[PDB]
Structures are given as C-alpha cells and as structure tokens.
Design an enzyme around this catalytic site. Structure first.
Site, PDB file in Angstrom:
ATOM      1  N   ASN A  39       0.969  -1.234  -0.055  1.00 48.44           N
ATOM      2  CA  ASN A  39      -0.099   0.013   0.083  1.00 48.44           C
ATOM      3  C   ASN A  39       0.773   1.341   0.085  1.00 48.44           C
ATOM      4  O   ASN A  39       1.218   1.856   0.990  1.00 48.44           O
ATOM      5  CB  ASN A  39      -0.991  -0.011   1.207  1.00 48.44           C
ATOM      6  N   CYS A  45      -0.752   5.747  -6.784  1.00 51.09           N
ATOM      7  CA  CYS A  45      -1.915   5.805  -7.356  1.00 51.09           C
ATOM      8  C   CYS A  45      -2.125   4.595  -8.445  1.00 51.09           C
ATOM      9  O   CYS A  45      -2.805   3.856  -7.645  1.00 51.09           O
ATOM     10  CB  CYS A  45      -1.834   7.217  -8.142  1.00 51.09           C
ATOM     11  N   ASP A  86      -6.969  -5.434  -4.685  1.00 46.78           N
ATOM     12  CA  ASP A  86      -6.857  -4.346  -3.838  1.00 46.78           C
ATOM     13  C   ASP A  86      -5.477  -4.351  -3.135  1.00 46.78           C
ATOM     14  O   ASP A  86      -5.181  -4.814  -1.793  1.00 46.78           O
ATOM     15  CB  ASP A  86      -8.024  -4.207  -2.908  1.00 46.78           C
ATOM     16  N   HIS A 141      -8.625   5.946  -3.896  1.00 43.82           N
ATOM     17  CA  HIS A 141      -8.309   4.569  -4.156  1.00 43.82           C
ATOM     18  C   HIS A 141      -8.405   3.550  -5.335  1.00 43.82           C
ATOM     19  O   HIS A 141      -9.504   3.682  -6.028  1.00 43.82           O
ATOM     20  CB  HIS A 141      -9.162   3.632  -2.824  1.00 43.82           C
TER      21      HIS A 141
END
Ligand SMILES: O=C([C@H]1Cc2cc(Cl)cc(-c3ccnc4cc(CN5C(=O)CCC5=O)sc34)c2O1)N1CCNCC1
Length: 341
Positions: A12, A17, A275, A258
C-alpha cells in the site's frame, strides 16, 4: 493472500496511485513476463536499472507469499512523489515502463516482444468531396483512448472513434494548391494487437470553471468484444473477437483516492480483485457489471482485452525454469544481504 487466490498483492503505497493496478495487469500478461526475465540485465546497476526493477517486482510477484514492494522500481524511473503520478495518466506510465523494456530487448532473443503484444496500426485519412486530393498517414499505436460521454458502451465508443467527421462551413480543409475545400476526415483500424489496452475518457475540459470535470456515467463493456466491423479489411482465418482480461478502477476523491484492478489471469472467467496487498476472489459481476457507473438512483478507467486466437500464446504458463539462473542468483543475493541485519 496467496492461499485463497494463488496470487499476491503489492504494498500500500498511496503516492503510486495507479501503478499497482498496472503492474498486476502487466505481470499477468505472461508472454511479457517471460520475455522480461530474459532481458540481459547482468550488466546493469541495481538502483537505476528500470529493466532490473521490473524483473525484481515480477520475480517477487511470482515467488513471494507476503506482499511485494515497489520502492526500488519507483526510484528507477524517477516518479518518487504523488505529483509525478498525478501529472501523468496510466498509458503514459505504461509507455515509460515498456519503452525501457523494449529498448533493453533490442539485439536479443526477445526483441520485438512489446510490438508483438501491444502495437496495432491505423490509417488517418483526409478526403476532399469535390476535388481529387487524399492525405493518408499510417500511425502505430500501443493504446486506444475511447470517448465515453453520451456513449452507452464500447461498441458505441468504437462507432465514434472510427466515425467520419465533415469539414464544411467555417472549418473547411486547407487543401494546398487546390485551395479551401469541403472534405471528410476519419480514422480506420488496420490491425488490432493481441493485448488491447483501452483507456476510457473519464475527464473532459469544461468551458466555464476552467478545469477538468470528471464523468461518473454508466459505461457498459462486455466480456466478449467483437471488433471485425471496426477493421478496414477483416480476416476469416483470425477474427477480432476479444476476451476481457482486466478492469482498472478508481473510487473517491481525484486528488488521491483508492485504485483497484479486477483481473481474469488465466482468461477462464475466474475473477479476482487486487486491492493493493489484499488479493481476493470476486464474481464476474463484481468485476464487470458492478464497475459500470454511478447507479444508485466508482468508475472503470482502463480495460485490457486479449485476442481469442492469441489467448493461449499470450497467457502461456510461466514456470520457475523461465527465469534465468543468474537473475535468480542476483535477486536472492539482495534478499540474503538485506535480511542480514
Ligand atoms: O484525476 C486524476 C485521478 C483520479 C481518477 C479518476 C478516474 Cl475515473 C481515472 C483516473 C485515471 C488514472 C490514470 N490514468 C487515466 C487515464 C484516463 C483517460 N484520460 C482521460 O480521462 C483524460 C486524458 C486521458 O488519457 S482517466 C485516468 C484518475 O486519476 N488524475 C489527474 C490526471 N491524471 C491521472 C491522475
């Protein structure tokens, strides 16, 4: 998690981006991945070799259990900050990576691979109605940017892309020695590449405000995408039936927000949601139907399609054998020295 899905996430990093979305998209383009491992990067310097950093990430995404870092890859091409990512779009980053990789591959056994996978060809034509003058240019392309405003779907976006514009009235065509002229302006696809990269034009300039306003419209896109009717000359031996592979998605505020990629890595309709560090299984509908638009009464922005005929070749099984020994030596030698703390 690798146990549930088979695949692993990336760290993360919010600054990045859309990079993590793109890296997974490129990693599960298997033919690229194999070719990337073949690049002769035994010569190159660790900190600054873009080829090597993309080998490192790929290597680790293939082998790791725990989430994969991108700190060394971000440092190589020089987009350390958030503004470096904001200033560019996903296709420009895809050019920065692939233009490095293609250039390393020249004079090797794996030369031509980036054009093999990604490069189609098109004619842009201007044709005068009354007078005999026609200007053609051939252009290569590595990606198509499609118009979505007022368009229900990809078929309609392609209709628009190829559709013929009239040069009449105030905006007639300056036709050289033949003078100002009524003319037709248009574009025509010659070839569609095996791996097709489509960006959906989610931003437009606005006359008032003096800024880019975003479009949160329902834009429908299919699992199976037939494109023969957008080619100039078709082929019965190899139709342009494309199969959906990946869907890159944004949510929330533009100045950040996100990013997720939904992917179909074997091309067998078994969808996962990537994710960042959390890879998980999801329905076809979560990937496709549910990323259409602002339908309450979140937006898809890039789509990847693979040519049905080229699918087995493009998504050929990668094995540990397909990474060279010297690269495995080198990348484990980092993990030996870096762990030694
Ligand atoms: O606003 C954003 C955030 C929020 C945000 C929201 C969405 Cl739904 C998509 C992106 C995005 C992310 C990456 N690539 C691309 C390509 C797109 C296609 N397209 C256009 O729409 C105009 C010209 C062009 O090529 S949309 C896009 C994005 O990024 N940015 C400021 C500008 N560059 C990106 C960062």
């Amino acid at each position: 998690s690798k146990k549930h899905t088979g695949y692993v996430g990336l760290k993360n990093q919010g600054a990045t981006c859309y990079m993590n979305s793109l890296l997974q998209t490129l990693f599960f383009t298997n033919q690229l991945r194999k070719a990337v491992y073949m690049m002769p990067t035994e010569g190159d310097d660790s900190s600054k070799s873009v080829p090597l950093a993309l080998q490192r990430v790929f290597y680790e995404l293939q082998h790791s259990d725990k989430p994969v870092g991108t700190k060394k890859l971000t440092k190589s091409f020089g987009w350390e900050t958030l503004d470096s990512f904001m200033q560019h779009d996903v296709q420009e980053l895809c050019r920065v990576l692939l233009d490095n990789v293609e250039n390393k591959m020249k004079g090797t056994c794996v030369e031509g691979t980036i054009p093999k996978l990604f490069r189609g060809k098109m004619v842009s034509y201007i044709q005068c109605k009354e007078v005999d003058y026609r200007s053609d240019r051939r252009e290569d392309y590595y990606d198509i940017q499609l118009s979505i405003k007022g368009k229900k779907n990809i078929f309609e976006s392609f209709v628009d892309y190829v559709a013929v514009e009239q040069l009449d009235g105030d905006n007639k065509y300056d036709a050289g020695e033949h003078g100002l002229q009524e003319a037709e302006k248009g574009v025509k696809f010659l070839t569609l590449p095996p791996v097709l990269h489509l960006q959906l034009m989610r931003f437009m300039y606005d006359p008032q405000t003096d800024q880019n306003i975003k479009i949160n419209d329902r834009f429908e896109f299919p699992e199976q995408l037939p494109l023969d009717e957008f080619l100039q000359k078709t082929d019965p031996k190899d139709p342009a039936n494309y199969i959906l592979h990946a869907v890159l998605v944004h949510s929330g505020d533009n100045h950040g927000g996100h990013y997720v990629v939904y992917l179909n890595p074997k091309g067998d309709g078994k969808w996962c949601k990537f994710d960042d560090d959390v890879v998980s299984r999801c329905t076809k509908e979560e990937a496709i139907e549910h990323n259409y638009g602002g339908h309450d009464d979140t937006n898809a922005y890039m789509l990847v399609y693979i040519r049905e005929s080229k699918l087995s070749e493009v998504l050929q099984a990668v094995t540990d054998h397909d990474i060279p020994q010297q690269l495995v030596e080198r990348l484990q030698e980092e993990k030996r020295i870096e762990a030694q703390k």
